[PDB]
Design a protein around this ligand. Sequence first.
Ligand SMILES: CC(C)=CCNc1ncnc2[nH]cnc12
Ligand SMILES: CC(C)=CCNc1ncnc2[nH]cnc12
Ligand code: NA
Ligand code: NA
Ligand code: NA
Ligand code: NA
Ligand code: NA
Ligand code: NA
Ligand code: NA
Ligand code: NA
Ligand code: NA
Ligand code: NA
Ligand code: NA
Ligand code: NA
Lengths: 163, 163
Amino acid sequence: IDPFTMGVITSESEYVSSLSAEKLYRGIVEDGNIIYPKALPRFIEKAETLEGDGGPGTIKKLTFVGDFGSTKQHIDMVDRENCAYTYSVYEGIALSDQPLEKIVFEFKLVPTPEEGCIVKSTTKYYTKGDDIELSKDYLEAGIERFEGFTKAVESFLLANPDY
Amino acid sequence: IDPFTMGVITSESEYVSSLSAEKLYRGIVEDGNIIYPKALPRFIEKAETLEGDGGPGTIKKLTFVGDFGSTKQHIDMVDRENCAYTYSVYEGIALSDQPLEKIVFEFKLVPTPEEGCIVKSTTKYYTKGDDIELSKDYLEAGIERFEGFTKAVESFLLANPDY
Ligand SMILES: CC(C)=CCNc1ncnc2[nH]cnc12
Ligand SMILES: CC(C)=CCNc1ncnc2[nH]cnc12
Ligand code: NA
Ligand code: NA
Ligand code: NA
Ligand code: NA
Ligand code: NA
Ligand code: NA
Ligand code: NA
Ligand code: NA
Ligand code: NA
Ligand code: NA
Ligand code: NA
Ligand code: NA
């Protein structure tokens, strides 16, 4: 029958940050070039803007410390008002024998009266090909890394409010 | 005057393992292809031998989960009798604006009466060029990752003696 087939696999994780939405958002989205290497000094070597002004359509690049390469982030949505940010990664994303078309990363930070904010993180894996095999470890890996970056930045900013 | 100049920067870390030298060594060196992905399921996707039989001269490759590339390990010394292992990495190793010729990784596991063994880890950074600038974070990074792999494997093997 020869159908066109695609899988979109969504993983969602939340946690409560002590840092306010606005500060966490500014740290990652506006000051990432400075803060990513300060928050993860032994993993992220450099974060820079390759193309664009910071909004939708911007291409950023993270360079990792040591023999772990580098990756471009293709910015898709930037919503300061609602502390929402989305970007895609297109290269070097095959998960074992499962090719992918893209991985999409999205967060939305929601102010909460008790603490700082609720950090709502999503990763979406878009599959290439006619079938699908993704283990729990690989699906969890993307969302753990992504939320891990956010937690590192939160922790840094709480310890050094000077940024 | 035009001298030939090279830096060799050595970082050394030790800790006491509960697992015996022989088992930790076998796990990493002989059964790495199986154990590395079990010990670090969300970071190391695959560990395979590309060339050789496992001894000196063998080339192994680690593939990392997600957009973090892959790296070849060029095996230099394999000493089962003394639980010693050395390998080099040659590619993708520039540390910021400091090019490197190679990074060498070495461990020696020494049986200890109280616990299992003393894990003696070393990383050596060989610099390319006429001057040198390496921050504490980058020097610490290599040895933390390396010792981190060993600790992950130790922990896995203690929880699953079936390997
Ligand atoms: C599958 C997996 C472990 C993905 C992790 N990669 C990433 N996770 C979060 N943000 C990123 N930017 C570039 N690469 C990124
Ligand atoms: C500088 C740094 C963070 C190095 C870490 N890289 C590695 N550390 C330990 N073993 C390895 N095998 C291949 N690459 C390896
Ligand atoms: Na940190
Ligand atoms: Na690097
Ligand atoms: Na790259
Ligand atoms: Na990459
Ligand atoms: Na709040
Ligand atoms: Na398809
Ligand atoms: Na583990
Ligand atoms: Na990969
Ligand atoms: Na590679
Ligand atoms: Na690599
Ligand atoms: Na012992
Ligand atoms: Na030189």
